[PDB]
């Protein structure tokens, strides 16, 4: 109800619009007592269209298509969501 | 920046033999997505680096079956199972797990071979250099093995050491041989004050040196 | 195919400036991060600049911060590196890399206060026997490297040993050997082709018998 | 609470991930008793980060910048539909 | 500098297929929607294919749906128009346009059962004033276009290349050039002409009678 | 699609005069953002179309201040305050407000000018053409105004009309003149049945016809 982002089943996803490398994104989320989204939780829901191409917890971008990559994801920047317990 | 240590600095292996390079990182190269981003690059002289292996053990297209990558955390290995003449260059390991990309110290592969004697040829100073004011006597030593070679210069049966410039080529990718060029440099004046100019090449292929010489006037 | 061509590069006096170009084709420029990588004389590979995918983030190492700037152009797909306050440690062959997968061809940069000198080209003919004649070519007293050398404008390239240049004093020396059969020379005019890019010099010299 | 999208001040923003031209976007929102977002409503709020480059009810894409060598009338973009909630 | 270049386009028989190309540079290919517009012989302008920004959507007019397909190449930055079941009304100069702002030079597409025929080229010199006129007759060729220069481009001032005219499934073109009496026959004036549809590239020197 | 009607089809205006074209859409071109997307393109012959005016009234860079766009809903006007030689071609209005882009019928601008007489020029068949057994005589009439010109072919004194191919060039962009080319094509034998070959041009510039002729025997 007071979640300035995506509220889903007692969880609040806050968008960070600043492009960052996974490491830094993860660090920033942790620094605010939060984690990055999990590829499992968010897929096959409605959050998918908001979080696609943003950092998942595993270090890979969240994707509908887990295809078989000509670019080290560990060398790219992406926007990110930080997740916390709302209720 | 993550530190990459390669072992050894120089590799010297006979054609037909197995070879191995080591690579060590200061951190685990395990990225949180289960993948390990260690790569193996190879660079011939006068050529850009070409990737031979990615993600520890995956081979690039074209890459022969003889190249094998291993290892997990901080320790990695590239095996060339049977060294061939085309394999010469500098091999780097490069990590891509942690920003930024960091490289090893390089490993230069030198190919061993059966001994071969050089084809020595001497050349008098050019007619156009004498016109300018200098004079340089050149001696080519071509297609030999091993790399170690000694060249003595002689002006009138007397050893000269000042003004000599020696350069070896990069090993041949076809027949694995070295070639060397020796240049003796003198003034137009100094050259004309002498007559007998000799080039004396010592190699392990024979006890006797390979002697090439000329006389100034004899032409 | 993926293509990367480096441009710019040349002799620069310590504390000078230089702008390098990386023309890219065969891929959507913006959808890839690109590195600027240099190869030092001791032949180690070093990153000097990073621009992220999308162009959003640009990073540099501490030895290079405050004097290198990575530019971009989405119009022409070209990537630039503007370097200034150039040190002796900045010397080397500069590559742009689209991951460790694809490297450019490199553009040479020399940071020396020694001035550009035009090379001297000398033909090498035998002393006034056998079925194998060896001829040579001498390139003397020039700055800086590199120098292109071919035989018969490129026609003859087998059995040729182009020897790497060596420094004596602010000057380089280079030589090149070529072995043909006795039938070929002097029957067919063998010419040494040599070009110095830095001083815009490109002269040819025919090997004439003694 | 039962807003499958962005909730803000008695309004629910449903993202349409299908790229559409403005005229079609406006239609799909109306066909669901909603409208496209209002620029003033979203600019200077947390929704701007989600809705930039999506259609605004006026026919322009919502942008932080008020620019342009492009004929927006001929382009396609994603869009949100706004139904009032509570 | 934004640049667009059309490609392909030959003579096609009523039913055949043809694939056109629009090569781009000077702008981010994906950032822009691009149209395929054609110009009929009556010289009206018609859209035949639209591809959205980011390539997401493609659209065609009813006259062209089910036979025209627009392709793309994000690597090379090239735009394709694949056409098939070609009607005679599909005939014209085809343009790709990055908005009404930027149009390529265009590419010629002719739909006819009439067979390709190479041009016969004839030099025109006067019979045996202060200024001299010389000409060149391009006769009996199909289809358009043909390219005619004078001294391969060196001489272009005072030229009059006349528009091709159909007579009976064959075109005839003529071109005149004027120089002063001092220029000709003192210097060589050559009539260079090329017909790509038949791979003809013939040069013809103008010699006095 | 949105129907765009231009009026008139052709415009014939003297240099230095005001001109105007109208453009009517079947539907308001007022887009939801307050802007109206009407464009005026100008296409020279042999060239791709170029835009002059966008958003009803705004001029592109370079475009002279002579061109002025107007209109609001379904009714639009392009005014040229003083016609200059270079303005020739077909003007289109095209609407951007509704997908897809749709164009008007076009409005050809034919420049009116002071009178000029044609420089007439006649040409006997080439030696190469006779080889093939067909002969054609070509007559060039260059840089005249107005476009209307009567060309008669006369063989041994009497008019011939069979095998006549005429072509007018598009008005010159600089000097606003037209040029014409008439071609009479015969069989070789038929050409060799006569000797007088006259190209006769009747233009309003002179009361007499411009006669250009040759005799087959004059080489």
Numbering used by the authors:
A (entry chain A): 98 to 165, 167 to 185
B (entry chain M), F (entry chain L): 1 to 219
C (entry chain I): 1 to 128, 132 to 213
D (entry chain B): 98 to 164, 167 to 185
E (entry chain H): 1 to 128, 133 to 213
Article, verbatim:
The crystal structure of the ectodomain of A33 revealed an unusual C-type lectin-fold domain, similar in overall architecture to several NK cell ligands.
Sixteen residues of each A33 subunit are in contact with sixteen residues of the A20G2 Fab. The Sc value is 0.68 and 0.69 for both antibody/antigen binding interfaces, while the BSA is 802 and 864 Å2 for each of the two Fab/A33 interfaces. As such, the A20G2 epitope is slightly larger compared to A2C7. Despite numerous amino acid differences in the CDRs, A20G2 approaches the antigen with an overall similar topology compared to A2C7, with the exception of CDRs L2 and H3. Similar to A2C7, the Gln173Arg mutation also fully abrogates A20G2 binding.
